[PDB]
Amino acid sequence: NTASWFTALTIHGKEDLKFPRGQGVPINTNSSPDDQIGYYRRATRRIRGGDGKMKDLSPRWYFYYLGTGPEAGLPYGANKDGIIWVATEGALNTPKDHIGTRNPANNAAIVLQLPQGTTLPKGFYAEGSR
């Protein structure tokens, strides 16, 4: 019923997802500068897979706007394992109820894209590539 608006950010390795301050918010042209704030949550569920379903086993992090998702009531900066906070310069510290979450039966996920100039996290590239 509820899901991230964006595809997963897979972090290939045993390191938390991190972004320098002012970076890490996925691009969404249907959002305003005041909205660019939220959290990434590490997915708990393991990959069951099946025929032709071959996802990388490394931890997946899903972006949720502030005031939405499984940690909707957490204030910005709250310390919780598997939760990392991100905010673009100019974003307002208010719940983004008007964006909300995605219903995976009705809308496809937006491919997660980060803007140029973003410092890419350690583990952004799969093992054996770089």
**Residue for token digits 């894209």?**
113
Give the experimental resolution in Å: 2.2
The reply to whether 37 falls in a domain is yes
The reply to whether 101 falls in a domain is yes
Q: Which helix (H) or strand (E) holds 121?
A: none
The reply to whether 130 falls in a domain is no
Q: What are phi and psi of 71, to 5 degrees?
A: -120, 40
Question: What's the token pair of residue 125?
Answer: 């590239």
Q: Is 102 annotated as a binding residue?
A: yes
Rounded CA separation 90/83 (Å): 22
The reply to whether 52 falls in a domain is no
Residues in contact with 67: Cβ distance below 8 Å, sequence separation at least 6, in sequence order: 94, 95, 96, 97
Output the furthest CA–CA distance in the chain (Å, rounded). 45
Q: Is 60 annotated as a binding residue?
A: yes
Task: Supply angle C-alpha 77, 101, 72, rounded to 5.
Answer: 30
The reply to whether 84 falls in a domain is yes
The reply to whether 89 falls in a domain is yes
**95 touches 69 (CB < 8 A):** no
**Residues linked to residue 38 through DSSP beta bridges, in sequence order:** 65, 86
Q: How many domains does the chain have?
A: 1
Task: Supply angle C-alpha 44, 107, 63, rounded to 5.
Answer: 40
**33 touches 93 (CB < 8 A):** no
Host domain of residue 12: 1-46+57-114
The reply to whether 15 falls in a domain is yes
Rounded CA separation 64/37 (Å): 9
